[PDB]
């Protein structure tokens, strides 16, 4: 067979430097273990400094912090500060009461 | 001797399903592999049972006749093997593989 | 910022059932393939000839092959050896 699963091969980006270890299975496993959604902050409005309570009339943004059924995600998952989690939950509950979410 | 080994290698089932009393619930019928010594036992017992249906008073004669028929293709024990392999193919998903 | 959770002083640092990677038996995977080969191409089909030959060799002497991969985890030996050093406990 001339085919390998993507999970068993690492694609080295262009312009990056590499070591011989980057072709091993250890690199594959190490990349899985340390795979965190750290790029969310730059794409996370609520981790930028905006007040989540100003989005109570924008269900599309709020729908990014609820599950498929509408359950607000725990702070352990959202990664927000205590204040933003508190404000975000209020925004979602207010949005639900207005009839938008 | 070569005829005997060829007959034993064709008649013995490669695998056999066994019931394992695992858990308080119903036992699981999981296909199990067989080694060559275990395969020969299964095939030999089938041969002896077929041999003992023949008319000769001498077991050697009945065994000889049975072995000659098996070496010539005709044997009623090939049905037994096909029925043991059918069951195993049905329970292929029950295998554990770890 | 990621919340670090610090444990209280503990009588032990131990994994109840250390996980081990148990490589699959080569004879059982061969049997699982042969059984599948018969399910598609049929029982005794000439397409599964190689599978039958390989299975016979794998199980010829031992029906599970030469199982020589038994392993035990050492996490509990290291965990108990290093706990006092790395727990960050204040001085006495």
């Amino acid at each position: 067979t001339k085919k390998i699963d993507q999970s068993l091969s690492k694609k080295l980006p262009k312009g990056t430097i590499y070591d011989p270890f980057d072709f091993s299975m250890g690199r594959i496993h190490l990349d899985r273990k340390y795979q965190a959604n750290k790029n969310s902050n730059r794409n996370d409005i609520m981790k930028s400094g905006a007040n989540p309570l100003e989005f109570y009339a924008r269900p599309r943004i709020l729908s990014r912090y609820v599950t498929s059924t509408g359950r607000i995600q725990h702070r352990d998952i959202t990664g927000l500060s205590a204040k933003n989690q508190r404000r975000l939950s209020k925004a979602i509950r207010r949005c639900q009461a207005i009839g938008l979410m | 001797i070569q005829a005997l080994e060829k007959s034993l290698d064709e008649l013995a089932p490669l695998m056999m399903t066994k019931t394992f009393n695992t858990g308080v619930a119903k036992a699981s019928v999981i296909p199990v592999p067989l080694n060559k010594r275990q395969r020969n036992r299964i095939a030999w017992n089938w041969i002896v049972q077929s041999a003992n249906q023949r008319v000769s008073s001498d077991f050697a004669v009945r065994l000889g006749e049975e072995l000659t028929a098996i070496a010539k293709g005709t044997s009623s024990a090939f049905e037994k093997r096909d029925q043991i392999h059918k069951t195993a193919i049905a329970h292929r998903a029950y295998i554990q593989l770890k | 910022k990621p919340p670090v959770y610090r444990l209280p002083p503990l009588p032990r640092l131990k994994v109840k059932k250390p996980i081990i990677r148990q490589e699959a038996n080569k004879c059982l995977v061969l049997m699982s393939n042969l059984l599948q080969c018969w399910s598609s191409y049929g029982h005794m089909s000439p397409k599964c000839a190689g599978l039958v030959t390989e299975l016979k060799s794998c199980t010829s002497e031992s029906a599970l092959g030469k199982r020589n991969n038994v392993q035990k985890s050492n996490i509990n030996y290291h965990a108990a050896r290093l706990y006092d050093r790395i727990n960050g406990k204040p001085h006495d």
Partner: peptide, 25 residues
Amino acid sequence: EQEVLDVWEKKVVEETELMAARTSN
């Protein structure tokens, strides 16, 4: 890199065969 790519070849093949058996289930 060859030394590493040789071990990687073996494991890939092994893990692309366990998947085939496990997936067959």
